[PDB]
Design a protein around this ligand. Structure first.
Ligand SMILES: [Zn+2]
Lengths: 150, 198, 341, 159, 126, 81, 58
RNA sequence: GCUCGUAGUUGAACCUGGGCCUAGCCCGCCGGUCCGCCUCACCGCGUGCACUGGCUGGGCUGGG
């Protein structure tokens, strides 16, 4: 239940029924795919892609219009991030916290949150390793996290 | 002590009635059966049985003739006349799926049949021209319909709204009366044979 | 007989309903194997099988009527399958062979086929019904069948009235028996309440495409003998609109045949003039309807002399008012027939 | 494609050809389509309903325009229920057959209601925002779905 | 978390039969739950249920049953063991049923003795 | 209470239930069409937009994001589908 | 009015036929309205009824 | 004292092509009777809302 901190929180995004039409929200799937490809080329994460689509174009879900999800489409056209988005954001967050610790050390709450983030990264990292995404042996410390940054 | 007992069916006995001669009928999920409980030898075996017509739920016998209607679970009621009908005539609302829970012949006005169904609805039936007549959807499910034995047009539905609704069969716009006193759902309602109590 | 000996030796004992239905399937397929094949012996063999069934049945246990309605119901001992089997053998044999269709052979079966119709089992009832449809036409030299066909007529009407849908096989077999009785035997009169009930039940089965030909066979059978009643008039007022407003030719032609037999047969001038206003209005009337009403006008001009003069006089002028392209060529053929008569 | 024509396949293909010229001023999926497939098997008694099978990207190509195309296909052709569907060759396929059956209206829920014995009845509900023009087409929907698949379903608006 | 969604469903059924309600909302559905309720409906302890979709199950119950339960390790059982397992799980041999995941499907112990097949004990009701 | 039809809740009790707690869950958000009176351009905006949606050019606005529904701007029209 | 009309949809034809059945059943309950009215407006009701006696006119 | 965490432990649901037989009807083909056609004749053709039988011809639906 929201992992680390206590608190349930039922903040969830709903998905409607009939995974096919939203008809009056026109535009062919091919056009949507090409827009997604353009966004990927400009350098945006799948989640950011989805948000952009939500903002401007007549879309509901890519999985509805097109046969595939965004990440799956990116993988088919070989335009996917090095470290699968969420993992990349977590490592960026960990780097930021380490840099804050380096600037000022006594902040024990920041050190605790750093530890939490590292644990969450390890939790993600193990399961990514299992699903043959990331190459075996993946360190997530200041020796490699700093090199990764972006 | 009892007068006559028999291990009738496998499942629970959902509906049961007496014929106008002396014999009694019983529903189940097995199918309905007919026995002669008043005979000079006691017979445990039935003398007629009926399985075709879906899972039956309730029975109701006619006032005068040997006709009876069984409410099934296929959304139809079906009407037999004893001694010259075998499968009966299946009357239904034209596109109806939900089960008809109860069925009740009007004893005053013959050939008017009321029924409730788990669409939270009551439906009527005219037996003279074999078709349904009118269907009203209420808010909650109704467990049982019954008619008034002195006033031919008034009916009462016992419903899961903890409530009894006394309706007029000619104008289903509003309830003639709403009896509200319960705590859990109402399972059975029955008018007095003087027609003035419940 | 080597086939039916172990069956009897098995089903003489106490039995349950699944194996009862098994023996029913076995016996109906024995009858199908019999009806493809030395024929008088087949007749006396059927009679002997039915005699052994009547010997084996207990006379204290008979079908009794319904306690609530005073007639008999059309619906684990399963003895009736042998009767179904034997009458199905008789059905196939008397269907295929004309020289056995004698008045002398079936006097042994006239009290035998009596309890075949009166039985409460659906299988033996439809077997008896199809049997009597085959054996309408035998004179019998003394009108001995003139009580059996009264009984069969009453029970066929009762079975259609008690069946839940007329689209079932028992109601259709009874409808076949009623239609062949009305086509052939003029000794059996029809009751107006029964005919009203039948036509009111067959209003939509007229346009149902699966049973269209059977119900229209029955309707032509009613229109064969003169039956002037309000139900027949009110249903032919509906066959009038079935002729024009229906979509397909296979229903349109059967409606044309029925309405045409009506106009050829039925004996006021006001009414016949109303038919002519109707037919001219449909001529004005969609293009498939124009084609069908033009071919009905053509049939009337062909088969019909004062009526010829009147139908030509009132059909010629709106036709040249009409004079889509197929309807125009058809109207040209129609006015050519008008000039020819 | 797949066909050499029957008696009515050439008639419906001639209707698709005739909707190009001598009419509107609207054609987007009309010229890139050929003779495809059609079927004529009864619905109810007396009436029939025409179904036409469609290649699988042309289903969204037809979701582009289906208002007044099916109106003129009903009026100008035979006065019977016209109905387009994709062609296919399990449970995802039958789900696809349902959601391409109901073309303006999105289905919401499927209620597979059992009875007091082993018998069960499926009933798929529709959207409440479009009710008036579909209810006389519901039995045609149910009968075409039975005739194509074999599973008896009944269509009902929620109340 | 109880991965035994069958146990969550059966806990909801026991709570409704204790509280005297007339229906439930079994929120995570399955197929083994549907087969379980199919056996309970054959033996009449549950009126009528429907699987609606987002799915969940709405289970009209008659008010006839006492207790539902799952056997959590799901032990294997032969027929000569099945008699002793029935008389050790049920309060009486004529009251209630033991559910079996056999090679012929999911059924009660009387249907298992009819169809001459053994299997794993999955649950029971009475 | 004690018995109720759980496969057929009322639309009014269904409509006041939270999103994820309706019988089959579904959203309660909608899409709008928006024009700004000098332009014949029809941008289609989501109801709970997080983007400061801009029309096809003309550095304007169409809505601002919030904690809930996007506040459409000023004088603008909206049909909702 | 001897001209036939177009056949309607099955739902609308059923609805008109069942409206006719509702009018017929309302007539056969309007034959009971007057006795129901007298029973509810009367001052003293005597049960069982005189018409249900098994020796009615003896 | 609380949180993270490894060996360990429990680990969501979703997942039975071809041919043969059979009954009912239709559409069509074929043999004969009747009638008509044409051929000098021999002969053949049309011919089942005139009659009758066949088709391991075609189509739909049900059952194995
Ligand atoms: Zn603009």
């Amino acid at each position: 239940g929201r992992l680390h901190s206590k608190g349930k929180g039922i903040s969830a995004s709903a998905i409607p029924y009939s995974r096919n039409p939203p008809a009056w929200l026109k535009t062919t799937p091919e056009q949507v795919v090409e827009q997604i490809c353009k966004l990927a080329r400009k350098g945006a994460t799948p989640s950011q892609i989805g948000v952009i689509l939500r903002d401007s174009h007549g879309i509901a879900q890519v999985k509805v219009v097109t046969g595939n999800k965004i990440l799956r489409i990116l993988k088919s056209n070989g335009l996917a991030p090095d470290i699968p988005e969420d993992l990349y954001f977590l490592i960026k967050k960990a780097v930021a916290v380490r840099k804050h610790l380096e600037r000022n050390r006594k902040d024990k709450d920041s050190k605790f949150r750093l530890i939490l983030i590292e644990s969450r990264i390890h939790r993600l990292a193990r399961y990514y390793k299992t699903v043959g995404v990331l190459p075996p042996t993946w360190k997530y410390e200041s020796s490699t996290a700093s090199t990764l940054v972006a | 002590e009892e007068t006559w007992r028999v291990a009738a069916h496998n499942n629970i006995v959902k509906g049961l009635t007496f014929t106008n001669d002396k014999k009694l009928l019983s529903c189940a999920t097995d199918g309905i059966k007919l026995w002669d409980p008043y005979a000079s030898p006691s017979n445990t075996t039935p003398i007629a049985t009926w399985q075709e017509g879906g899972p039956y739920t309730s029975l109701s016998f006619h006032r005068s003739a040997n006709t009876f209607a069984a409410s099934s679970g296929q959304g139809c009621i079906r009407i037999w006349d004893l001694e010259h009908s075998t499968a009966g005539q299946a009357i239904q609302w034209p596109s109806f799926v939900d089960t008809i829970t109860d069925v009740c012949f009007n004893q005053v006005e013959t050939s008017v049949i009321g029924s409730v169904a788990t669409d939270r609805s009551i439906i009527l039936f005219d037996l003279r021209t074999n078709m349904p007549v009118i269907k009203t959807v209420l808010h909650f499910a109704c467990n049982r319909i019954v008619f008034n034995p002195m006033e031919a047009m008034n009916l009462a539905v016992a419903s899961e709204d903890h409530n009894i609704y006394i309706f007029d069969a000619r104008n289903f716009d509003k309830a003639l009366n709403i009896q509200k006193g319960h705590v859990a759902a109402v399972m059975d309602v029955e008018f007095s044979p003087t027609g003035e109590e419940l | 007989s080597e086939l039916t000996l172990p069956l009897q030796s098995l089903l003489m004992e106490k039995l349950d309903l699944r194996t009862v239905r098994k023996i029913d399937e076995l016996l109906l397929r024995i009858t199908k194997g019999l009806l493809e094949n030395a024929s008088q012996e087949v007749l006396v063999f059927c009679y002997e099988v039915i005699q052994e069934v009547y010997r084996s049945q207990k006379p204290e246990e008979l079908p009794k009527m319904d306690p609530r309605l005073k007639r008999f119901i059309v619906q684990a001992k399963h003895t009736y399958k042998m009767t179904r089997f034997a009458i199905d053998i008789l059905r196939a044999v008397m269907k295929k062979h004309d020289h056995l269709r004698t008045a002398a052979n079936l006097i042994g079966f006239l009290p035998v086929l009596g309890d075949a119709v009166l039985a409460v089992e659906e299988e033996v009832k439809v077997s008896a019904f199809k049997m009597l449809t085959v054996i309408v036409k035998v004179p019998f030299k003394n009108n001995e069948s003139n009580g059996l066909y009264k009984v069969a007529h009453k029970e066929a009407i009762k079975s259609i009235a008690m069946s839940s849908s007329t689209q079932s096989e028992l109601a259709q077999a009874a409808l076949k028996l009623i239609s062949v009785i009305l086509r052939d035997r003029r000794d059996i009169q029809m009751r107006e309440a029964a005919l009203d009930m039948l036509l009111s039940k067959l209003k939509d089965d007229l346009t149902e495409p699966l049973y269209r030909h059977v119900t229209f066979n029955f309707l032509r059978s009613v229109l064969d003998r003169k039956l002037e009643t309000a139900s027949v008039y009110d249903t032919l007022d509906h066959v009038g609109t079935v002729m024009i407003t229906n979509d397909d030719k296979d229903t349109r032609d059967l409606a044309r045949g029925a309405f045409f037999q009506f106009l050829r047969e039925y004996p006021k001038r006001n009414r016949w003039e109303k038919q002519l206003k109707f037919i001219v209005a449909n001529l004005k009337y969609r293009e498939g309807g124009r084609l069908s009403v033009m071919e009905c006008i053509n049939l009337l001009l062909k088969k019909s002399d004062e009526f010829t003069q009147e139908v030509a006089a009132t059909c010629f002028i709106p036709l040249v008012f009409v004079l889509s392209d197929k309807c125009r060529l058809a109207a040209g053929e129609l006015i050519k027939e008008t000039f020819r008569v | 494609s797949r066909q050499n024509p029957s008696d009515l396949e050439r008639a419906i293909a001639g209707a698709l050809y005739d909707l190009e010229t001598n009419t509107a001023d609207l054609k987007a999926a009309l010229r890139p389509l050929q003779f495809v497939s059609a079927r004529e098997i009864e619905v109810g008694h007396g009436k029939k309903a025409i179904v036409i099978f469609v290649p699988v990207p042309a289903l969204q190509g037809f979701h582009r325009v289906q208002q007044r195309l099916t109106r003129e296909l009903e009026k100008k052709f035979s006065d019977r229920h016209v109905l387009i569907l994709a062609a296919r060759r399990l449970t995802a396929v039958h789900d696809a057959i349902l959601t391409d059956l109901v073309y303006p209206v999105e289905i919401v829920g499927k209620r597979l209601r059992t009875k007091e014995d082993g018998s069960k009845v499926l009933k798929v509900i529709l959207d409440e925002k479009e009710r008036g023009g579909v209810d006389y087409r519901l039995d045609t929907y149910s009968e075409v779905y039975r005739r194509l698949t074999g599973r008896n379903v009944t269509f009902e608006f929620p109340q | 978390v109880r991965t035994s969604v069958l146990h969550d469903a059966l806990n909801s059924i026991n709570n409704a039969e204790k509280m005297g309600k007339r229906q439930v909302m079994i929120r995570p559905s399955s197929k083994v739950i549907v087969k379980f309720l199919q056996v309970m409906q054959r033996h009449g302890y549950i009126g009528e249920f429907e699987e609606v979709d987002n799915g969940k199950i709405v289970v009209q119950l008659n008010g006839r049953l006492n207790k539902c339960g799952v056997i959590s390790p799901r032990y294997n059982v032969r027929l000569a063991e099945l008699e002793k397992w029935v008389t050790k799980l049920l309060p009486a041999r004529q009251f209630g049923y033991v559910i079996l995941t056999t090679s012929a499907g999911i059924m009660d112990h009387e249907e298992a003795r009819r169809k001459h097949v053994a299997g794993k004990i999955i649950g029971f009701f009475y | 209470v004690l018995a109720v039809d759980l496969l057929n809740p009322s639309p009014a009790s269904e409509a006041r239930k939270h999103k994820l707690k309706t019988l089959v869950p579904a959203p309660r958000s909608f899409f709008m069409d928006v024009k700004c009176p000098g332009c014949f351009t029809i941008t289609t905006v989501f109801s709970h937009a997080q983007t400061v949606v801009i029309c096809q050019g003309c550095t304007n606005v169409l809505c601002q994001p919030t904690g809930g529904k996007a506040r459409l701007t000023e004088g603008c029209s909206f049909r909702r589908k | 009015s001897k001209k036939l009309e177009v056949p309607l949809a099955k739902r609308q034809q059923d609805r008109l036929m069942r409206e006719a059945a509702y009018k017929k059943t309302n007539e056969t309950l309007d034959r009971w309205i007057e006795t129901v009215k007298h029973n509810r407006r009367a001052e003293h009701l005597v049960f069982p009824l005189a018409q249900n006696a098994h020796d009615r006119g003896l």
